[PDB]
Amino acid sequence: LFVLDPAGDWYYCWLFVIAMPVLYNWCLLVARACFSDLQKGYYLVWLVLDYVSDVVYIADLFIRLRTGFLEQGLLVKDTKKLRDNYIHTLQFKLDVASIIPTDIHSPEVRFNRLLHFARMFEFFDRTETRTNYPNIFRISNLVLYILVIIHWNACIYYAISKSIGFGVDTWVYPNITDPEYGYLAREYIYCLYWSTLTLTTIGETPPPVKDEEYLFVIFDFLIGVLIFATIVGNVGSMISNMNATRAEFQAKIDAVKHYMQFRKVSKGMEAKVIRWFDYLWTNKKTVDEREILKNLPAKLRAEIAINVHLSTLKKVRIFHDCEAGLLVELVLKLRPQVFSPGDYICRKGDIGKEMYIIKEGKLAVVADDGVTQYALLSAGSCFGEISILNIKGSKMGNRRTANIRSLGYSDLFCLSKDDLMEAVTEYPDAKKVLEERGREILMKEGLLDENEVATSMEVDVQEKLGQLETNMETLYTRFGRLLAEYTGAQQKLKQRITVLETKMKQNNEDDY
Amino acid sequence: VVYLPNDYVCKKGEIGREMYIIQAGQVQVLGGPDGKSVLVTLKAGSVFGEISLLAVGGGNRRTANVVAHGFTNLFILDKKDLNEILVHYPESQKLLRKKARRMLRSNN
């Protein structure tokens, strides 16, 4: 058996197939009923198109019986479960009533096909989430709704004019018998013009003559007010959404610009900040990475972070033999960092508690004078790996031994000392290997052996007093426990020697 | 946390640090000579992996593969969260340590 998946692609392709007869029925049935020249003139065209629409209407009933639904996260493919889920709904009633046979060829008896319109609204709702361009479609979808209302109002005006009589007064459509006005191209196009002119409330419609005519124009003006206010609200809300990214970014610059003039920030630093915000907007780096992925689950976030950082993180010497579980923990700890050109990542003699990996950009190891450069660090290079390791003895003392400067804008990912400690709480053996590898590297440099007799103690006098209190309570339980094991043995010891003592003492009486 | 179909809730040999409560969906404990064969299917309301909370860092390793069957919504309590809770309840902390010792002694 075949069961369709609503999230599936083939279901959406069917949604287009059913929505076209529904849209055709909503547009052409009212026109054929009102404009008799349309019905009689193209009777053979409507005969074929009505049959094709009815075939799709019956097919949609069979499709609705074969669309699965998620129950406990699983798609239901049972024939009885799908049938019972659809039949008892209200949509089954509309769908059956839609396709009920007419037992005349007139378009009025086919007005039941106007029901089951929900397939058309679902297609528009489904297309908007699928399209790359969501605002272009939303305008196009909104314009189509205006056209259907304008076309429907055009047909009602012609129907009202027919009921009142053609040419009886100035408000109604002119005389059909007059060849100047009586042909299908003129009467639809003028009625389309009249409906647009009246609903949009821009131009001036011919004044009504009768009280019945006054009511219809009042109704159109009231309807056209609600349509126009809905148009402006929909388009105005779209424009707010497109501008929202720029509007909230311009507020950040304006807030920072106010601070620099308030605190008298020097013009050299002030222009540095302004140049930074232009880089963020031009290259579209305004949104923070951490805020983007915060909603994602930890499994999906780890899957993304593996594809970005795991290739470069496994190139690190200390993380050479790290377990696969630890490496996932480390790449989740990496934090993005962006540096302007000429920025110093770290300076000689500065405390270092982070390791940096270069995602993009070029960094240069430089002398005390910035221009002269010893070496170049490209994308994928890492530095500061030993700073995050808490080696017991280090001549470095977690202080940077090189000056690192960015030649241009560089994207760095930093693993801190604390983040490494948190990751290796659950991997104790790996922590030992990381420290041993760092110790070996520090031997090769010659900066390992230090603090053999140097130790730092920061325990409080009240906290050190606690261990003295703690040690006393532990000993008293032992004093009972050491004796209870021993005295029971000692109680056992006295009888077993005594019975050997007494029996051998009785032997001495037999001796003499 | 919502799991996609055929996602690995637990992988054999991975660190266990969480307790899962099945709010919706099913998970399957895959095992066998071939492997990847369903042994037991846990429906909603089931709680599994609770023993990993009492373990020390690196103490618990998952012993079987647990795979979500369809879209599974689980409620997860991390070991770090339980450890941060337990500092305010020394009596329950001592009771849980005693239960951990009993679990270690009785099984071995």
From Swiss-Prot, chain A:
Task: Write the record's keywords in alphabetical order, separated by commas.
Answer: Calcium, Calcium channel, Calcium transport, Calmodulin-binding, cAMP, cAMP-binding, Cell membrane, Cell projection, cGMP, cGMP-binding, Coiled coil, Ion channel, Ion transport, Ligand-gated ion channel, Membrane, Nucleotide-binding, Olfaction, Sensory transduction, Transmembrane, Transmembrane helix, Transport
> Can you cite a GO biological process for this protein?
calcium ion transport
Q: Outline which residue ranges sit on the Cytoplasmic face.
A: 69-93, 130-136, 244-512
The molecular function GO annotations come to: calcium channel activity; calmodulin binding; cAMP binding; cGMP binding; intracellularly cAMP-activated cation channel activity; intracellularly cGMP-activated cation channel activity; protein-containing complex binding
As for subcellular location, the record says: Cell projection, Cilium membrane
Which region ranges are annotated with the description Selectivity filter?
Answer: 201-204
Where does the chain cross the membrane?
16-37, 48-68, 94-105, 111-129, 137-160, 184-218, 219-243
Q: Where does 3',5'-cyclic GMP bind?
A: G384, S387, R400, T401
The UniProt site entry described as Central gate is assigned to: F228, V232
Membrane topology (Extracellular): 38-47, 106-110, 161-183
Q: How does it sit in the membrane?
A: Multi-pass membrane protein
Region of interest called Cyclic nucleotide-binding domain, as start-end residue ranges on this chain: 324-444
User: What is the reaction catalyzed?
Assistant: Ca(2+)(in) = Ca(2+)(out); Na(+)(in) = Na(+)(out); K(+)(in) = K(+)(out); NH4(+)(in) = NH4(+)(out)
The cellular component terms of Gene Ontology attached to this UniProt record, alphabetical and capped at eight, are: ciliary membrane; Golgi-associated vesicle membrane; intracellular cyclic nucleotide activated cation channel complex; non-motile cilium membrane; plasma membrane
User: Which stretches of sequence are listed as region Ion conduction pathway?
Assistant: 134-242
Which residues fall in a coiled-coil region?
461-512
Give me the residues that bind 3',5'-cyclic AMP, please: R400, T401
> Which residue intervals make up region (C-linker)?
244-320
Function of the molecule: Pore-forming subunit of the olfactory cyclic nucleotide-gated channel. Operates in the cilia of olfactory sensory neurons where chemical stimulation of the odorant is converted to an electrical signal. Mediates odorant-induced cAMP-dependent Ca(2+) influx triggering neuron depolarization. The rise of intracellular Ca(2+) levels potentiates the olfactory response by activating Ca(2+)-dependent Cl(-) channels, but it also serves as a negative feedback signal to desensitize the channel for rapid adaptation to odorants.
Q: What is known of its domains?
A: The C-terminal coiled-coil domain mediates trimerization of CNGA subunits.
Q: Which family does it belong to?
A: Belongs to the cyclic nucleotide-gated cation channel (TC 1.A.1.5) family. CNGA2 subfamily.
Oligomer and partners:
The olfactory cyclic nucleotide-gated channel is an heterotetramer composed of CNGA2, CNGA4 and CNGB1b subunits with 2:1:1 stoichiometry.
- In Swiss-Prot or TrEMBL terms, this protein is called Cyclic nucleotide-gated channel alpha-2
Ranked from the top, the taxonomy reads:
Eukaryota, Metazoa, Chordata, Craniata, Vertebrata
Quote the gene name from the UniProt entry.
CNGA2
Swiss-Prot record, chain B:
Cellular localization per UniProt = Cell membrane; Cell projection, Cilium membrane
Task: Tell me where on the tree of life, at the top rank, the source sits.
Answer: Eukaryota
Amino acids binding 3',5'-cyclic AMP: R62
Cite the residue spans of the region called Cyclic nucleotide-binding domain: 1-104
**What cystine pairs are annotated?**
none
What outcome follows a substitution of N6I?
In RP45; likely pathogenic
Binding residues for 3',5'-cyclic GMP, per the UniProt record?
G49, E50, S52, R62, T63
Q: How does it assemble?
A: The rod cyclic nucleotide-gated channel is a heterotetramer composed of CNGA1 and CNGB1 subunits with 3:1 stoichiometry. CNGA1:CNGB1 channel binds Ca(2+)-bound CALM1 via CaM1 and CaM2 regions of the CNGB1 subunit; this interaction modulates the affinity of the channel for cNMPs in response to intracellular Ca(2+) levels. The olfactory cyclic nucleotide-gated channel is a heterotetramer composed of CNGA2, CNGA4 and CNGB1 subunits with 2:1:1 stoichiometry.
Disease entry from the Swiss-Prot or TrEMBL record: Retinitis pigmentosa 45: A retinal dystrophy belonging to the group of pigmentary retinopathies. Retinitis pigmentosa is characterized by retinal pigment deposits visible on fundus examination and primary loss of rod photoreceptor cells followed by secondary loss of cone photoreceptors. Patients typically have night vision blindness and loss of midperipheral visual field. As their condition progresses, they lose their far peripheral visual field and eventually central vision as well.
Record family assignment: Belongs to the cyclic nucleotide-gated cation channel (TC 1.A.1.5) family. CNGB1 subfamily.
Comment on protein domains = The cyclic nucleotide-binding domain (CNBD) comprises three helices and a beta-roll of eight beta-strands from CNGA1 and CNGB1 subunits. Upon cNMP binding transmits the conformational changes to the C-linker domain of the S6 helix to open the ion conduction pathway.
Per the entry, what this protein does is: Pore-forming subunit of the rod cyclic nucleotide-gated channel. Mediates rod photoresponses at dim light converting transient changes in intracellular cGMP levels into electrical signals. In the dark, cGMP levels are high and keep the channel open enabling a steady inward current carried by Na(+) and Ca(2+) ions that leads to membrane depolarization and neurotransmitter release from synaptic terminals.
Q: What is this protein called?
A: Cyclic nucleotide-gated channel beta-1
> Lineage from the top down?
Eukaryota, Metazoa, Chordata, Craniata, Vertebrata
Q: Which gene encodes it?
A: CNGB1
Full-protein residues shown: 981 to 1088 of 1251
